[PDB]
């Protein structure tokens, strides 16, 4: 099943809706789950409309033709998690892709830094460089690696942090792995980044 919104942006007190697409004629009255990061899932609504015993009456399912929706009456600061479907089939049950509800926020542009490979690492024989994106919003951003204007690929690996609790903003860092032989060949290394809060892409570089 493919839930149409894969990430919601809502602030406290708004009505929120998640929809589930039963992409087959195997409609079997989905049941909706919730999972906090690093916990076991829970059950909220079974039989596509009824409420699990001990769940606040904010949550309430429905069924719009061949689509199943979960609507939250008012979004409290405890309803920030991931929601799944549990459509069943002839002999197996399937879990939807899951949508993540995040807290809404004034758009922020990232601050970009670049760090050269450490000198001690050169003795090891595998040099790594990293450019860092700091304190931006929303998550969607794209970093591009260029070495002497050649656009490399497959040598980068990036990991993003989680939403901060104070100001609710992210931070990303992508790193480039090069052997010492390949590193010593080229002259300039550049990190290019784009984001919706940037009118023009910003590039930070350094000389080897």
């Amino acid at each position: 099943m493919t839930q149409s919104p894969s990430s919601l942006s809502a602030s406290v007190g708004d009505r929120v809706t998640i929809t589930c697409r039963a992409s087959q004629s195997v409609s079997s009255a989905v049941a909706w789950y919730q999972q906090k990061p690093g916990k076991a899932p829970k059950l909220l609504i079974y039989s596509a409309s009824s409420l699990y015993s001990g769940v606040p009456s904010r949550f309430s399912g429905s069924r719009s033709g061949t689509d199943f929706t979960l609507t939250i009456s008012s979004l409290q600061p405890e309803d920030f998690a991931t929601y799944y479907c549990q459509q069943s089939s002839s002999s197996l049950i399937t879990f939807g892709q899951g949508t993540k509800v995040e807290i809404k926020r004034t758009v922020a542009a990232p601050s970009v830094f670049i760090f050269p490979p450490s000198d001690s690492q050169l003795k090891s024989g595998t040099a790594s460089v990293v450019c860092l994106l700091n304190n931006f919003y929303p998550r969607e951003a794209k970093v591009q690696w260029k070495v002497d204007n050649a656009l490399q690929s497959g040598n980068s690996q990036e990991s993003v942090t989680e939403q901060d609790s104070k100001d609710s903003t992210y931070s990303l860092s992508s790193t480039l792995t090069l052997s010492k032989a390949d590193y010593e060949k080229h002259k300039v290394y550049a990190c290019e980044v784009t984001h919706q809060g940037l009118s023009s892409p910003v590039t930070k570089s350094f000389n080897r």
């Binding site: 409609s27 009255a29 049941a31 829970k42 059950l43 079974y46 699990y52």
Partner: peptide
């Protein structure tokens, strides 16, 4: 018997989970 029950209007869900 959850294969026998499940239909266009019923689905009982999984009640209790372990921590894994």
């Amino acid at each position: 018997y959850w294969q026998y029950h499940a239909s266009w209007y019923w689905n009982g869900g999984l009640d209790y989970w372990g921590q894994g």
